[PDB]
Scaffold this active site. Structure first.
Site, short mmCIF file in Angstrom:
data_model
loop_
_atom_site.label_atom_id
_atom_site.label_comp_id
_atom_site.label_asym_id
_atom_site.label_seq_id
_atom_site.Cartn_x
_atom_site.Cartn_y
_atom_site.Cartn_z
N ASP A 118 -33.29 32.36 -4.64
CA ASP A 118 -31.62 32.75 -4.67
C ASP A 118 -31.51 33.54 -5.77
O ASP A 118 -30.25 33.58 -6.27
CB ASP A 118 -30.83 31.29 -4.44
CG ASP A 118 -29.41 31.66 -4.04
OD1 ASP A 118 -29.44 32.58 -2.92
OD2 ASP A 118 -28.48 31.21 -4.48
N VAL A 174 -20.61 21.26 -7.47
CA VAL A 174 -20.82 21.20 -9.19
C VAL A 174 -19.67 20.95 -9.73
O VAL A 174 -18.58 21.45 -9.26
CB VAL A 174 -21.65 22.54 -9.34
CG1 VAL A 174 -20.52 23.47 -9.35
CG2 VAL A 174 -22.28 22.40 -10.71
N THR A 219 -21.76 24.75 0.96
CA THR A 219 -22.96 24.41 1.63
C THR A 219 -23.89 23.58 0.48
O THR A 219 -24.55 22.62 1.24
CB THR A 219 -23.49 25.19 2.47
OG1 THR A 219 -24.92 25.15 2.41
CG2 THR A 219 -23.12 26.71 1.80
N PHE A 220 -23.87 23.87 -0.61
CA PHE A 220 -24.86 23.44 -1.62
C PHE A 220 -24.59 22.08 -2.04
O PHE A 220 -25.46 21.37 -2.69
CB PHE A 220 -25.03 24.53 -2.63
CG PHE A 220 -23.56 24.90 -3.19
CD1 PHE A 220 -22.95 24.11 -4.14
CD2 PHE A 220 -23.08 26.32 -2.86
CE1 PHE A 220 -21.65 24.58 -4.44
CE2 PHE A 220 -22.08 26.60 -3.18
CZ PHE A 220 -21.17 25.61 -4.20
N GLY A 221 -23.30 21.80 -1.91
CA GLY A 221 -22.98 20.23 -2.48
C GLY A 221 -21.75 20.77 -3.32
O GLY A 221 -20.71 21.33 -2.88
N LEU A 246 -16.20 23.56 -10.81
CA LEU A 246 -17.03 24.67 -11.12
C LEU A 246 -17.74 25.24 -9.56
O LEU A 246 -17.88 26.40 -9.73
CB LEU A 246 -18.28 24.33 -12.19
CG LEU A 246 -18.32 24.91 -13.28
CD1 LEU A 246 -17.11 24.73 -14.05
CD2 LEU A 246 -19.42 24.41 -14.06
C1 LIG Z 1 -13.36 29.77 -8.96
C2 LIG Z 1 -14.20 30.07 -10.24
N1 LIG Z 1 -14.25 28.68 -11.02
C3 LIG Z 1 -13.88 29.06 -12.21
C4 LIG Z 1 -15.14 29.89 -12.78
N2 LIG Z 1 -16.34 29.27 -12.63
C5 LIG Z 1 -17.52 30.50 -13.03
C6 LIG Z 1 -18.70 29.40 -13.50
C7 LIG Z 1 -19.81 28.82 -12.87
C8 LIG Z 1 -20.73 28.13 -13.40
C9 LIG Z 1 -20.61 27.50 -14.74
N3 LIG Z 1 -21.30 26.77 -15.47
C10 LIG Z 1 -23.00 26.25 -15.19
N4 LIG Z 1 -23.70 25.79 -16.33
C11 LIG Z 1 -24.83 25.23 -15.96
C12 LIG Z 1 -25.11 24.98 -14.66
F1 LIG Z 1 -26.54 24.53 -14.37
C13 LIG Z 1 -24.56 25.55 -13.50
C14 LIG Z 1 -25.03 25.23 -11.99
C15 LIG Z 1 -25.95 24.46 -11.61
C16 LIG Z 1 -26.30 24.47 -10.19
F2 LIG Z 1 -27.42 23.81 -9.45
C17 LIG Z 1 -25.66 25.23 -9.23
N5 LIG Z 1 -25.71 25.45 -7.67
C18 LIG Z 1 -24.70 26.39 -7.33
C19 LIG Z 1 -24.56 26.90 -6.07
N6 LIG Z 1 -24.27 26.82 -8.51
C20 LIG Z 1 -23.02 27.65 -8.64
C21 LIG Z 1 -21.80 26.94 -8.85
C22 LIG Z 1 -23.53 29.14 -9.39
C23 LIG Z 1 -24.55 25.99 -9.70
C24 LIG Z 1 -24.32 26.19 -11.01
N7 LIG Z 1 -23.14 26.06 -13.92
N8 LIG Z 1 -19.44 28.06 -15.66
C25 LIG Z 1 -18.42 28.88 -14.91
C26 LIG Z 1 -16.71 29.06 -11.03
C27 LIG Z 1 -15.32 28.20 -10.60
#
Ligand SMILES: CCN1CCN(Cc2ccc(Nc3ncc(F)c(-c4cc(F)c5nc(C)n(C(C)C)c5c4)n3)nc2)CC1
Length: 368
Positions: free
Chosen positions: A139, A28, A24-26, A20
């Site tokens: 953020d 997911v 830099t954040f790690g 997902l």
């Molecule tokens: C190349 C595109 N591919 C296919 C499309 N896809 C879009 C997408 C993005 C997110 C979800 N679902 C989801 N549900 C619950 C959550 F809590 C997080 C969550 C938690 C955290 F702590 C995060 N910290 C950071 C930096 N992020 C980022 C990832 C936003 C966090 C996300 N994400 N579903 C689809 C992206 C990858």
């Protein structure tokens, strides 16, 4: 760390299915809670000591958020926490689509005001709970606002990044702490920043949602504050005097006709840094009131149009109040939930308008 299919915890265990995100954040990753039919998101942090209390603080705030029940305050729910291969993991509920990928889906078409309202109301109540607990998101950006279920729940949303959150005990900014297009003036200039930092981010977000494009798509921090003062007026003398980074973007003209401060001309910047400044705004504004006259062909006639003209007057009214250069005078979460635009007072003045009957039907449908 990284893998294609396996993981475990204390009470629960998770298999990974697809990636997902990674940066830099790690990392997911989306997983399946075996024994059930839940799909969850779990985020792994990198196992290096120099990033130790950066992870300790995110958990410490996630805990202080599960208690006080941030859930149902339009925040993502944090299920549990554990470790795996020395790395630290965090389990979240799975949301479907973030507003960036949603705008990209419609080829960045502007979203109508009737749809923008419920989204704001929710993101406001989420920030309101933050301020009552003394926390800053840091953020808030389109990528970090997601639709629970854009088909079964047309408009519910929740927030989903905390890698930048912090308590209000901080009164100093050492380095960058927002996504540039939504970084508040306090961060760019270098002043004691408060929770208002996020309310600015919310200004560029709702602005982005109405225009369909970043309000201030600055390529560098210079371009950013260039677009800002160019649109809303140069910052105030007292702000620029105590800013640490304000010497980098502004100059202290002591000319005969000086109020004490002038923005550095482009040529002065290109001669100083060596970087030619390309214009990036898909929209260029002399004033924020100028925002109400954008995308003006509406296919609405009669009372429907007058309501829309009044909806815009109150939209810029709030956008101006959210995007005050000053941190303190800027409107607060509790006060935006009361502003006429979220309130919809000015809409009552319009009986049997089929555009107004459909605006109210969007707020009432937000509960379901
Ligand atoms: C190349 C595109 N591919 C296919 C499309 N896809 C879009 C997408 C993005 C997110 C979800 N679902 C989801 N549900 C619950 C959550 F809590 C997080 C969550 C938690 C955290 F702590 C995060 N910290 C950071 C930096 N992020 C980022 C990832 C936003 C966090 C996300 N994400 N579903 C689809 C992206 C990858």
């Amino acid at each position: 760390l990284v893998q294609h299919e396996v993981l475990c915890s204390m009470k629960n265990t998770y298999e990974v299915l697809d990636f997902l995100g990674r940066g830099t954040f790690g990392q997911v990753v989306k997983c399946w809670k075996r024994g059930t039919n839940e799909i969850v998101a779990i985020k792994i942090l990198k196992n290096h000591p120099s990033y130790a209390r950066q992870g300790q603080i995110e958990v410490s705030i996630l805990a202080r958020l599960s208690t006080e029940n941030a859930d149902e305050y339009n925040f993502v729910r944090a299920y549990e926490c554990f470790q795996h291969r020395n790395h630290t993991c965090l389990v979240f509920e799975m949301l479907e689509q973030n507003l960036y990928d949603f705008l990209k889906q419609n080829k960045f078409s502007p979203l109508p005001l009737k749809v923008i309202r419920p989204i704001l109301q929710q993101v406001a109540t989420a920030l309101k709970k933050l301020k009552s607990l003394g926390l800053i998101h840091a953020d808030l950006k389109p990528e970090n606002i997601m639709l629970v279920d854009p088909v079964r729940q047309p408009y519910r949303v929740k927030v989903i990044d905390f890698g930048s959150a912090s308590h209000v005990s901080k009164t100093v900014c050492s380095t960058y702490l927002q996504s540039r297009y939504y970084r508040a003036p306090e961060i760019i200039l270098g002043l004691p920043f408060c929770e208002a930092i996020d309310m600015w981010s919310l200004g560029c977000v709702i602005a982005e949602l109405f225009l369909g494009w970043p309000l201030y798509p600055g390529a560098l921090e210079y371009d950013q504050i260039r677009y800002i003062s160019q649109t809303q007026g140069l910052p105030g003398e007292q702000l620029l005097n105590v800013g640490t980074k304000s010497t980098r973007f502004f100059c202290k003209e002591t000319d005969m006709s000086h109020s004490g401060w002038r923005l550095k001309t482009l040529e002065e910047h290109e001669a100083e840094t060596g970087m030619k400044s390309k214009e990036a705004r898909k929209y260029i504004f002399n004033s924020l009131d100028d925002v109400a006259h954008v995308n003006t062909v509406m296919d609405l006639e009669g009372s429907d149009l007058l309501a829309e003209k009044a909806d815009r007057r109150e939209f810029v009214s709030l956008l101006k109040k959210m995007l005050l250069i000053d941190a303190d005078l800027r409107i607060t979460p509790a006060e935006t939930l009361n502003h006429p635009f979220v309130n919809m007072k000015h809409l009552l003045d319009f009986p049997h308008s089929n555009h107004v009957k459909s605006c109210f039907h969007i707020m009432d449908i937000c509960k379901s």
